[PDB]
Amino acid sequence: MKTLIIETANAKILGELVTVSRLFGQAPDVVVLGSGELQGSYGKAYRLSDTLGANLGSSLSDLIKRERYELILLSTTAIGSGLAGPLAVSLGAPILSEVTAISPDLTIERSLYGSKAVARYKLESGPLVLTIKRKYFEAATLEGTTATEELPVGPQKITLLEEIEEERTGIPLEDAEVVVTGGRGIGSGDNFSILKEIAGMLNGAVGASRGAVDEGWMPPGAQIGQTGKIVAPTVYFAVGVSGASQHLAGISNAKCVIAINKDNEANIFKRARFGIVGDYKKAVPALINALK
Amino acid sequence: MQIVVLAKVVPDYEVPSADFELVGNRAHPRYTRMIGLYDENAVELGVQLKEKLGADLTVVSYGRNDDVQFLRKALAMGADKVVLVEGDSDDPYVIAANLKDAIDRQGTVDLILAGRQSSDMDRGVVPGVLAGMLDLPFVPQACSVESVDGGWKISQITETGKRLLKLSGKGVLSITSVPENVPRIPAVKAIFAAKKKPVEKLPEIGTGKMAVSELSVSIPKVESNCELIPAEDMDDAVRVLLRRLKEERYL
Ligand SMILES: Cc1cc2nc3c(=O)[nH]c(=O)nc-3n(C[C@H](O)[C@H](O)[C@H](O)COP(=O)(O)OP(=O)(O)OC[C@H]3O[C@@H](n4cnc5c(N)ncnc54)[C@H](O)[C@@H]3O)c2cc1C
Ligand SMILES: Nc1ncnc2c1ncn2[C@@H]1O[C@H](COP(=O)(O)O)[C@@H](O)[C@H]1O
């Protein structure tokens, strides 16, 4: 079916959307939002100079209507999400977001109830807008490049004043083979120091639950889960983390989850491979010593 | 000046899978109901704006008549009134169209706030669909908002950091969590007093739904059969853990 991918020039994210497109047809087109060479070979590609959906006016939607696209694919990213809902409305299209799987017969899966439930959907009448959850589909290798036709943007409603990267330390969370996550149980920002220490020793990265982020003990980009980062380390230490389902959603493919929690009834022990019921202020220093 | 916050009451979002069951593809009725978590972040931001600006703060919801008692928590936190459209649809277009009808009955509205995603549907769709229907700019995942000449200075959380934005005019913002919008906990006496604050009920309107069929909903089991390491003696426990990690080729 006639498919349009709308995304930044990012090859990892574009690749995930190409994988999804292949379920639906052989030759997707692409609208690139912002700058950067377009990798991959497409039948037709376009470019809009702005990444904020509010600034696009009606040109894009009118194009989609003219060209009779049947499927529009975006990522579940701030940029994808800024566009997807409003664009669906302009098309009169159904929208399904945060898609986690699509079967060969095009049954579409997504989560409900804090990632405790899996819902399955069938499209009855398109066009259809989908937003695809990051890190749930393999990224296609993108070979070659494709030139883009410039499209007009609309009235500027939102100005981008500044883009500010979170200060980076050590290996990225989503790349690390060992992740050490602290939750509310850690008790303070300074108390995270021993988690940073053991993470450094293991060439890993430090993550956080929403509890620890809401306390200000780690920055927001350290949050792991449904609305944070998705990680699949060999080892995942969950320290002072109760294991709410929304947290568990970030670690489904972690190979060896190690729980350190003083509460033997904590939900994290239903996901963990190994568990220590006890005070992390005793466990982690002991672990560090044994490693030294 | 008037700020609208969209708040949705949901089944307890902290119930574990072990204890979670469906009736008719939705949560069993036994679970405690509550305003969703990002919804409360949005209410909190709205109350902070009310405090700074002298604005009215109107909570708008689409849902069950008996969720008023839970929406009144927003009144105790500082909202001025609740407007509830009675209805039971999960469809984002139906929800958004009904929220739009309620909003259109509030005179001039300067800003609309919503949660990043609801605490039962997990989707982050309704605020963008409503922005489209209202023909207003949508800003997802805002964490802070400041009134300035001509509009709003907005900090947005992205996947690599944050963006500082200026919105000209009205808009719809969905709100993500940061320490600065952790919701305040209203006093028992504030809760009691909120029982008297205004609640306006509206009937549901006729409007179209999405042509999508929900085939099934299931709850995967969560049981890893964890190997619990005896930790009466913590030095022994970590010795055993490192041995097992070695044996299993994890570390
Ligand atoms: C829509 C939505 C999306 C969400 N997305 C996410 C997400 O992406 N990521 C996320 O993390 N959360 C998310 N949440 C929140 C999630 O539901 C929980 O609120 C949160 O994960 C709990 O954080 P926590 O486990 O750190 O804190 P708590 O649940 O308070 O757990 C603290 C734990 O620390 C233990 N503890 C205390 N002291 C010690 C000690 N000395 N030693 C060892 N253990 C100790 C306690 O036994 C307890 O189990 C989301 C919620 C909603 C509604
Ligand atoms: N039925 C509703 N009533 C009021 N607000 C809602 C409703 N459904 C969704 N919203 C708002 O939209 C946000 C995202 O919901 P969703 O798109 O379901 O994830 C919620 O956090 C609310 O702020």
Q: What is the CATH number of the domain that holds A291?
A: 3.40.50.1220
Find out whether the beta carbon of A261 lies less than 6 Å from any atom of ligand 1.
yes
- Residues ≥6 apart with Cβ < 8 Å to A234: A177, A178, A254, A255, A256, B250, B251
Bond from prior residue into A127 cis (ω within 30 degrees of 0): yes
Q: Is residue A172 located within the same domain as residue A233? A: yes
The string of DSSP codes covering B139-164 is: EEEEEEEEEETTEEEEEEE-SSEEEE
Q: Is residue A46 located within the same domain as residue A138? A: yes
Which domain, by its residues, includes A19? 2-165
| Phi-psi group of A94: left, alpha or beta (phi > 0 → left; psi -120 to 50 → alpha; rest → beta) | beta
Number of compact structural domains in chain A: 2
- Token pair of A252 as six digits: 């489904």
Which of A115, A148, A165 is at the close of a domain?
A165
CA A222 to chain centre: 13
**∠ Cα B39 A165 A174 (to 5°):** 80
Name the β-bridge partners of B213.
A122
Residue A75's Cβ-side half-sphere holds a number of Cα atoms within 13 Å equal to 28
Measured in angstroms, the CA of B196 and the nearest CA of chain A are apart by 32
Which residues of A define the annotated binding site for FAD? 184, 209-210, 223-227, 240-247, 261, 279-280
CA B101 to chain centre: 20
Distance in angstroms (rounded) separating the CA atoms of residues B103 and B58? 9
Q: What is Dmax (Cα atoms) for chain B?
A: 68
CA dist B87 to B67, B91, B103, B197, B243, Å? 11, 11, 16, 22, 57
- What SS3 state is found at B181? helix
Distance in angstroms (rounded) separating the CA atoms of residues A162 and B41? 24
Token pair 């409360």: residue: B40
Among the partner-chain residues B133, B140, B239, the one whose CB lies closest to the CB of A82 is B140
Nearest CA to ligand 1 atom 27: A184
Alpha helices per DSSP H over chain B: 37-53, 68-77, 92-104, 126-134, 188-194, 234-247
Residue among A262, A241, A261 at smallest CA distance from A251? A241
- What SS3 state is found at B166? strand
Which of A142, A165, A188 is at the close of a domain?
A165
Q: What is Dmax (Cα atoms) for chain A?
A: 67
CB distance B57 to B80 below 8 Å = yes
Q: Is residue A183 located within the same domain as residue A143? A: no
Q: Which residues of B touch A211 (CB under 8 A)?
A: none
CB distance A38 to A102 below 8 Å = no
Experimental method reported for this structure: X-ray
Ligand 2 centroid from CA B114, angstroms: 7
CB distance A4 to A64 below 8 Å = yes
Distance in angstroms (rounded) separating the CA atoms of residues B17 and B15? 7
Among the partner-chain residues A113, A165, A257, the one whose CB lies closest to the CB of B161 is A165
Q: Is residue A18 located within the same domain as residue A141? A: yes
Count CB neighbours of B200 within 10 A.
14
Find out whether the beta carbon of A204 lies less than 6 Å from any atom of ligand 1.
no
CB distance B37 to B89 below 8 Å = no
Ligand 2 centroid from CA B107, angstroms: 21
- Residues ≥6 apart with Cβ < 8 Å to B37: B13, B115, B119, B177
Find out whether the beta carbon of B229 lies less than 6 Å from any atom of ligand 2.
no
Number of compact structural domains in chain B: 1
CA-based torsion, B159, A129, A15, A252: positive or negative:
positive
Q: Which atom of ligand 2 is nearest to the CA of B5?
A: 23
Which residues of B define the annotated binding site? 6, 39, 62, 115, 118, 123-126
Q: Is residue A132 located within the same domain as residue A182? A: no
Count CB neighbours of B228 within 10 A.
14
- Token pair of B179 as six digits: 């320490």
DSSP B16: -
Which domain, by its residues, includes B226? 2-251
Ligand 2 centroid from CA A233, angstroms: 33
CA-based torsion, A184, A176, A164, B176: positive or negative:
negative
Contact B137 A85 (CB under 8 A): no
Count CB neighbours of B27 within 10 A.
24
Q: What is the resolution of this structure in A?
A: 1.7
Name the β-bridge partners of A29.
A4
Measured in angstroms, the CA of A99 and the nearest CA of chain B are apart by 9
CB distance A206 to A218 below 8 Å = yes
